[PDB]
């Protein structure tokens, strides 16, 4: 009735309600506590199996004891997409009990009894191994028959052919089965990729006069190489749907729209079309299909903004009206967040006609899926029912499992981290409003930590957020945030124009871009900026190449912070369990002054003893240096705001430093 | 479905496999995280119901939001022994949504629409309240259907008359019910009581010559008043069973036993009897019944050592030999811990004849339960199968639920704390080997929050443990540990002779009492020590009185440590959620020197603002003083090694100072 106890198993999420998250080729660490009566030794074997794909022959991996007694650790690396299962099985290994006990008493060294007990072990042990190589067992099983010196037949106890033999085929006693938990593996882009947010309309390129010109998918596609050139793996496009014509918004959040103004893309829908139609000015849907294929040619993928909202002109406003929250006087209520108003849209109502709306939205998501779009940016997901997301998310991947979702949830923790739990492959974070060494240090450790179920996407900016620190610290700071986002997380992102050092907010104390891109056409000339040397495009490229270069940067779990005695300096390191690759990042939070300090290292964390000395190389500088536990470091902006340092590869003791 | 989200419920143990622990009249704090779509407000109601006894119509308590968004906290206080159940139910309260939304918009200040929506709510709400006082809502509902002032029907919202009944009877929408978890409540002695350990035989009192004399229950009962006099609630007796005559141990763990020597009581069993018989030299079983009844007259309870072990001459050795571990040569193995030998006892074998041993031991426990013994100190339980204890425990408590078990498990955490999870009402701890300011600090804080499954019993000493710090720091230290034990835990204990300052170890570097009572008979003359002023009995008495006096000391959860800028000084405070009682303890760890420092307080923890100044009284000294956030303290041993301070009672905001 449960003789051997198994508890505090990890990774488990919400006590097993939600599966943990991992990706292909990621080392997944498993741990559990196994114990039994007295001083009889115990061991556990971790059993992993890969099932179907769904969502709502065993493989055996041996587990190893560790620092803390009775807690056993293991790892496994999943090789195909779908839903995996693991469980921990616990058993008592008498051989270990017998062996360890015997070595202590042999020291006292007659006693003839314990030896025979061993002798009956290997025989019973032997039945488990096939007659073929079982023959050193009978050597051991016929090892303490006859009287003699102690080192008589222990001689077979100690040689590593039968320790190795017992390893492949073990003597298992009192086997007890553990609980089963599940892991959901996604394609690697779920963890490691870089984002670019661009407006297709802004690819217009001016007219014969000064006036901005509306772009098209065709014009948009011309800018795709340059993006790929910077190393981004995913291109994110704001909604490509028709914009409502009533209450269309003007320049600067103005209530009244000029006849030519475009209005914000998130005001989805018009007499012209719904969520399933391309806004005609961009082109026919074939042009889009053509646009996707261009990106695909460059190694990139396309992600569309998915905003479950409607403009008044949206066909649903006419076709299906049960889907909204209707006021008492027959008017239809504008989407609302008190007392501020976003007048150009309608909130959906998920309670009046649930299976009605559910099936239609699924149809729509499926539409774009059929057109090569396999990454969606769910918009303001926290203002829609959770169970819906749990359903919609689970529903799409089961027919096709390579579709991934990103949650734009700027919301308090319980909701933000909560949403991740229900299936979102990625989530936005509070990253932008973390700017002090202490916010960032705890934040870095925080990310993650939550890796078993949350993978964060760190965005340096979004059309709605230009943090104050970018406003007054000048072009230097833009580098700093880029270094932080790119290094802290495998997944990071950027909004267009960031590369131009766009740092002007509409008015002081606001976080909205002046002459915001949501309401106006803004073609930009990146090439000229490059020529006059006022673009951060080369640097970002160098940042993006480096992450791809070092697989250490694709890890969530292994971030570790090292001590630097300067409030303005931040130093942390990441490593890869697989290749042993190891990297240390040192950045300044001060854009303005040269800063110097003494850097102290936790050598154990890098896999070396404290007195060691080793050589490092700076991937930006190319400089090589000799280092030890304590090293001198000085950072000078207007030369380089950060040092990305390559460190000696962590020995094949990588696996235990990943533990927990 | 679940339409509304419920997560991170606490207190839950091992994801619900094991019930949490609590006792009667203890405030049990419950917390959970509840959230839903958008800015619509949400609330939760905690539903508690009391089930039967067993082990392996509703009452409703409203839950309140707090500092951290979306996490709701609640409490309930169980009033009868048995198994309780609780679950969290989640719902959306539209009024709150409507109310909070309207107040923000009212400042903008026509609005003609929102008011009717409220008005259709309050009416929909009226359906929930029972014919009679239902009506001012309809009054509130029809006071703006009429056009008018904005402030006109806010009138009917404004009034504290309308926050009302709705708290008592609420309008609940989209109600979703949470998972169910269980709590097992024991009698209060499970948490709060003090222990005294005595050898019945040591109550012998010499003969006409100098020679010590073996005692009896009769003689043992003579020492019971003085024990009660010191305030102890439980008397713990080493096994009272017959001691084996074969391989019986001599003075000082000597291998050979003299003819008169008594042997260790844990060497259970002889030709005279087994576990079901009283050792005859102590008396007839009636004498025991008389002794137990005697203690109960004094307000005490009797606790017997439950040691699953056998001497060679034990009846089981012949009667049932399947129950033992028989060697290959037919001998049966002596108790063993490699390479140490415990020649006087036999380990049991729980695998050969499981239902065989299970059934005898349960019978044995029931024998003594029938004789008024409802507390057992299970001996070295970690050297017996886990599942067994889980079985034995659930089996005993269902017939009689007032039987409680204490686990002497000096074992690594996973096992020690693990064992507590299975049902052990109390557990021994690592307390004796914590002697530095940081260790005691960590240990005290550590007590919590494991309160949900572990209640620690802090023993200053046992026959097996005479700590080094006691060895050289003189009688002063003995006070210090007593203060630490009594204050840190609601439940604490003492082994006989401690009060006489017995401080001599067998050899330097050992933790065993010289001329140990386990192997030798040791009568003591407590009275003479009193006259000659070398007894810590008065002080201990004052300590136990103080504990009973302040109910704050019966709490596990609320211990909090305050900063004192001295490495030799330790200051912590406890309070009682019920009466608001609050107490602060300051103790010194150096027995030899006067020590002084500046004591800093976190007033918020004590329920006061930082600037407040207030009056306190020292329960040992008796005089009143005035204090503030920072106060001067100096401690002089050889007058008093600690200050136990009565502090201003925590206001009726105790409950919120308890969250999580
Ligand atoms: O060439 C690179 C550089 O060029 C441009 O800067 C030029 C600039 O136009 C010119 O006027 C001049 O500027 C002065 C500057 O006005 C002075 O204020 C002086 O800055 C010092 C400053 O007054 C100090 O307060 C000091 O504060 C530091 C902190 O010590 C740091 O901790 C850090 O604060 C961070 C903080 O730790 C966090 O907790 C969080 O709050 O976030 C903060 C990040 O801002 O940084 C602040 C401010 O840096 O720092 C300075 C001294 O250490 O410096 C100039 C006097 O020479 O200098 C430039 C001409 O060479 C362009 O604006 C820059 O973007 C570009 O990087
Ligand atoms: O009369 C009442 C009094 O009588 C007895 O004590 C007398 C004692 O027999 C007598 O010898 C004398 O004591 C002397 C002592 O011999 C000297 O050694 C000296 O003691 C100082 C000591 O050398 C210092 O190292 C200093 O150490 C403190 C630490 O500062 C504390 O941090 C603390 O250490 C704890 C530590 O923090 C933890 O990490 C952990 O390791 O546990 C430690 C606790 O053991 O305690 C030690 C010492 O307690 O403390 C002394 C500085 O004054 O000077 C002494 C006299 O100046 O004095 C006594 C009477 O004459 C009887 O044993 C006492 O119980 C009784 O109160
Ligand atoms: O849809 C028009 C509206 O867009 C923005 O408002 C939302 C929108 O859902 C997303 O862009 C997302 O970022 O959140 C925004 C704020 O909740 C604009 O902020 C707003 O000016 C515009 O009317
Ligand atoms: O049980 C008697 C036997 O062991 C003793 O030690 C005991 C101790 O008394 C108990 O607390 C029990 O739980 O386990 C201990 C074993 O380490 C004596 O130390 C020993 O001499 C005696 O033979």
Author numbering:
A (entry chain B), B (entry chain A): 15 to 70, 92 to 144, 149 to 699
What are the paper's exact sentences on this?
GlgE is an α-maltose-1-phosphate:(1 → 4)-α-D-glucan-4-α-D-maltosyltransferase that catalyzes the addition of maltose to maltooligosaccharides. One such example is GlgE, which has been genetically validated as an anti-tubercular target. Deletion of the glgE gene in M. tb results in the rapid killing of the bacterium due to the toxic effects of M1P accumulation. Overall, the Mtb GlgE structure is very similar to the previously reported Sco GlgEI enzyme with both enzymes sharing the same 5-domain architecture.
To further characterize the maltosyl acceptor binding site and the mode of GlgE binding to linear polysaccharides, we soaked Mtb GlgE-MAL co-crystals with maltohexaose immediately prior to performing X-ray diffraction experiments. A crystal structure of a ternary complex with Mtb GlgE bound to maltose and maltohexaose (GlgE-M6) was solved to 4.0 Å resolution. Initial inspection of the Fo-Fc maps calculated following rigid body refinement revealed a horseshoe-shaped density that was more than six times above background. This density, when fit with the maltohexaose ligand, corresponded to a single molecule of maltohexaose. The maltohexaose binds to multiple loop regions of Domains A and C that define a portion of the acceptor site; specifically, maltohexaose binds the short loop regions that connect secondary structural elements encompassing residues 465–481, 504–514, and 622–632. Specific binding interactions between the Mtb GlgE and maltohexaose are mediated primarily through hydrogen bonding interactions with the backbone atoms of residues that encompass the acceptor site, including the backbone carbonyls of T474, N512, and L628. Specifically, residue N629 in Domain A forms a hydrogen bond through the carbonyl of the carboxamide moiety, while the side chain of F631 forms van der Waals interactions with the fourth sugar of the maltohexaose. Surprisingly, the maltohexaose is situated approximately 26 Å from the M1P binding site; a distance that requires approximately three additional maltohexaose units to span. Therefore, the high affinity maltohexaose binding site observed in the Mtb GlgE-M6 structure likely represents only a small portion of a much larger α-1,6-branched, α-1,4 glucan binding site. However, given the modest resolution of the maltohexaose structure, the orientation of the maltohexaose cannot be unambiguously defined until a higher resolution structure is determined.
